[PDB]
């Protein structure tokens, strides 16, 4: 049984000079050079011991500098010897054949026309499928060279060709950096990037399928000095779907050496070379850090990335991290992660990152800092699985095994110390003693140590009184809980200014979602409104503020355009997790009586179960009908999260809260509608957004909303 083995290689010739005419295959000079090179390669192959198995040789391309011929050859050999004809063996045989004839007085027929350098011969394995892929792409083809410090712009592809290949060659000592930018909104082309001269599957750097909205820029590095780019399946005919730039980049060492200071703050970052570009296939990073004392351990906070264990033989695709001889492999997930490394004997810590296989993922950035070994989270609870400080005893389970909400004294309730009796938080520091001998209203004015439901003023100080924000009286020394309290004041069918923060998000003249104004230029909403196909484009949408009647215009309303649109990075469509989105307005809102922002709750804001809140959303009054012509308010009662966790069984996360409607009927709630709740000071606080629910018509099911206090950090980061 004869088997065909494919070897693709490059051979350098010093007696020939590259010319521009060789770049075009249709040129007569290129054809003559290809014929001569094929004849020389066939003679060289037949001269060696492999000539008995030689099948067919063909020169594929020519390169810059010394005349570099990239060709492919086939050997029909017995199967039993297939393991013996490794590419290294073939390369060694070719080198020996080239070297033997140099000293000999006899002149080879091919040596009379071409002088080949033995050191320049490179051979790699290939497959019949690789041969077919190369042999169908013999149409659209260009060759180019990239000089130092010069950025090259592509030459436009031909729409007639169904598969185009760019062959990129640069300096030997420089790496090639390739930039992809997405011009069209969405498109259906396929692209592949390979580290070698041809489309060899084993050498694939990265393959881009699809054409996405989330990220417009794709930056790819190549370990070598050569690169191949293959574009295929332009299905719906248009032009310029994408833009490539390319440039040479210097190689530098990412290994470092530092000593940590005395602090508990994140002191810096560690990143792969050329962040956020795709790391090189052969990268190697070594980081050495010295802690100031044995009492501090090292915390590494990741972003959409995590480490996990592996079985030694298995090579992990994502990457290999070694931490003090412990081996770990990455796993890109849409949740935060923190690796905590204790120190026992040596203050020095060593972190290594290595790429184990050819396939490369996006760059990795990790924030490093110190943490006191004992009680690592001060006033918080450390979830063991993912090493994050989660709130303790606030009624919300924040750890997969739920150890933060277990066997504590007063769950979501204040604890008198005189006789250990739980009393309600609204009774603390209100103005009348409710603990038997006055503990509840002690130390209300001074600074305290932070815990659960303790508002933290701007100078990292704490406040005893629960919900002290925007209540018309200073509560901490800083006075930061009364600044910017201009929101939340109002001016069944709603009236002409009952809910000034309500906004309508419309495209093509119809109302798809509702939203709540949170700043002068930002509107919060739900992410699942942009899930549809054509609706993700920013240009389409239009926002209306200060309107109650959908049918006819009224003096109050104003219309803006959406400038930017940011979804939450960890948003999951299948589980509705992290269902929140932000829209930037064209220009800031003028604070009239018709339009006023809603007050954003703090991270420690307490929303009490059993409290009544209002869902102010347009909705279809009857099943299957149009949206109602009048904005309709309806009240719901908050439910403890244990109850709806038992209702939904592994489907409700710390980022969601639950509300129940009037028993015996309604379900119409809109999408992205607010769930504002009134405070004791007469101000409305936005407590959630309409996310999902089951059962319009089921007897006792609840609606599930995006818990804003669980995503308040990202909101404040984006807005500020």
């Amino acid at each position, epitope marked *: 049984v004869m088997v065909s083995q494919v070897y693709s290689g490059s051979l350098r010739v010093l007696n020939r000079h590259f010319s521009q005419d060789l770049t075009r295959r249709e040129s007569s000079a290129f054809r003559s050079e290809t014929a001569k090179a094929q004849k020389m390669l066939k003679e060289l192959i037949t001269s060696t011991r492999l000539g008995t198995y030689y099948n067919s040789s063909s020169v594929y391309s020519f390169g810059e500098g010394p005349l570099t011929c990239f060709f492919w050859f086939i050997l029909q050999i017995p199967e039993h010897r297939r393991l013996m004809l490794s590419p290294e063996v073939v390369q060694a045989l070719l080198v020996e054949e080239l070297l033997s004839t140099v000293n000999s007085s006899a002149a080879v027929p091919y040596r009379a026309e071409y002088e080949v350098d033995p050191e320049g011969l490179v051979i790699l394995e290939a497959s019949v499928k690789d041969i077919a892929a190369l042999n169908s792409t013999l149409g659209c083809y260009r060759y180019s060279y990239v000089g130092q410090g010069q950025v090259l712009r592509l030459k436009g592809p031909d729409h007639l060709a169904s598969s185009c290949l760019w062959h990129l060659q640069g300096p030997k000592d420089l790496m090639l950096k390739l930039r992809l930018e997405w011009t069209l909104a969405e498109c259906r082309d396929r692209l592949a990037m390979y580290d070698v001269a041809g489309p060899l599957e084993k050498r694939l750097i990265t393959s881009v399928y699809g054409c996405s909205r989330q990220e417009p820029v794709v930056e790819v590095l190549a370990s070598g000095a050569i690169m191949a780019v293959v574009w295929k399946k332009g299905l719906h005919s248009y032009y310029d779907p994408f833009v490539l730039s390319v440039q040479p980049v210097v190689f530098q060492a990412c290994e470092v050496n530092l000593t940590l200071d005395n602090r508990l703050d994140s002191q810096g970052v560690l990143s792969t070379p050329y962040f956020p570009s795709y790391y090189s296939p052969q990268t190697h990073c070594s980081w050495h850090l010295t802690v100031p004392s044995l009492d501090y351990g090292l915390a590494l906070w990741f972003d959409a990335y995590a480490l996990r264990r592996q079985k030694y033989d298995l090579p992990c695709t994502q990457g290999q991290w070694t931490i003090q001889n412990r081996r770990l492999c990455g796993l890109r997930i849409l949740q935060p992660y923190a690796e905590r490394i204790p120190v026992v004997a040596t203050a020095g810590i060593t972190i290594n990152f290595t790429s184990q296989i050819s396939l490369t993922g996006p760059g990795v950035r990790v924030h490093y800092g110190l943490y006191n070994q004992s009680d690592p989270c001060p006033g918080e609870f450390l979830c063991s699985v993912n090493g994050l400080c989660v709130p303790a005893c606030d009624g919300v389970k924040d750890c997969p095994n739920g150890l933060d909400e277990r066997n504590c004294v007063c769950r979501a309730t204040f604890q008198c110390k005189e006789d250990s009796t739980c009393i309600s938080l609204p009774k603390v520091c209100d103005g009348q003693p409710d603990c038997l001998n006055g503990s509840d209203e002690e130390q209300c004015q001074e600074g305290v140590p932070c815990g659960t439901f303790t508002f933290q003023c701007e100078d990292r100080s704490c406040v005893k009184k629960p919900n002290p924000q925007c209540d018309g009286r200073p509560d901490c020394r800083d006075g930061s809980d009364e600044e910017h309290c201009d929101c939340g004041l109002q001016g069944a069918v709603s009236s002409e200014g009952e809910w000034p923060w309500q906004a309508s998000l419309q495209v*093509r003249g*119809r109302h798809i979602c509702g939203g709540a104004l949170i700043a002068d230029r930002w509107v919060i909403t739900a992410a699942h409104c942009f899930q*549809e*196909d*054509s*609706m993700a484009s920013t240009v389409l949408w239009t926002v209306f503020l200060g309107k109650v009647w959908q049918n006819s215009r009224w003096p109050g309303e104003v219309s803006f355009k959406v400038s930017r649109l940011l979804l939450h990075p960890y948003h999951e469509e299948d589980s509705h997790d992290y269902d929140v989105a932000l829209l930037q307005l064209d220009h800031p809102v003028v604070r009239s009586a018709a339009v006023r922002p809603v007050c954003l709750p703090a991270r420690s804001h307490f929303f009490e179960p059993g409290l009544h809140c209002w869902i102010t959303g347009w909705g*279809a*009054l*009857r*099943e*299957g*009908g*149009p949206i*109602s*012509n009048a904005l309709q308010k309806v009240d719901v009662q908050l439910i403890p999260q244990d109850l709806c966790s038992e209702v939904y069984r592994y489907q409700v996360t710390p980022r969601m809260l639950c509300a129940g409607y009037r028993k015996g009927k309604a379900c119409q709630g809109d999408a992205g509608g607010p769930l504002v709740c009134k405070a004791l000071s007469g101000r409305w606080f936005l407590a959630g957004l309409v996310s999902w629910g089951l059962g319009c018509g089921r007897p006792n099911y609840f609606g599930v909303y995006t818990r804003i206090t669980g995503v308040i950090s990202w909101i404040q980061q984006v807005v500020t």
Partner: antibody
Amino acid sequence: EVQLVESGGGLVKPGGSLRISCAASGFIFVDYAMHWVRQAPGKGLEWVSGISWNSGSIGYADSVKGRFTISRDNAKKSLYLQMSGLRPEDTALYYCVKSGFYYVRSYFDNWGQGTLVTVSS
Amino acid sequence: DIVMTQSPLSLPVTPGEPASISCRSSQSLLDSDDGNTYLDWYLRKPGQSPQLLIYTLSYRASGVPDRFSGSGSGTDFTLKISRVEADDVGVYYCMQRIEFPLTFGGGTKVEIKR
């Protein structure tokens, strides 16, 4: 202009299953509701199922509730109907109807040529 | 479920005189929230696909001529053909859409006398 092409149909064993599908063009697919309307060979028209602009409010008929399932795919711009538990009554000619608005209870705007589904031993 | 009845079951009309078709429901077709009647009149041609003639009891489609006029109140609805031509041959249906499950009417043939 507006084009709706149905596919599937044919002969089905009385007890098997089938899947039929529309094929819409000439309009922005994700703006309007979609309906299936079957007509018996000698009787009048009869509603089957209807779906809203984004599968938000699926609603079936009474005699086919629990046996049929309507769905859509805004990407391929297509409408699908999973029909199962066929009986000698379900034989008819099916029309793919494009409604006039985004909700199930809007007037029927465009009608397709329809495909015949027959059941026999 | 709103049962719809049509009258008469058949009607022969020569070209020139008006014709009337009556549709009676089991309930009233007024969405209180908007005051819109949810009845539509469709015409099924011989061997063709059904067309849309009247929607919401008053308005006509983009190709329907002026010879068709819809009217009614509450439960009793009337479609009037002012002048009958040789092309208005087929079956006429009245459909309600005020509740789920939507129900097509019964049918009314039209025959042209010559």
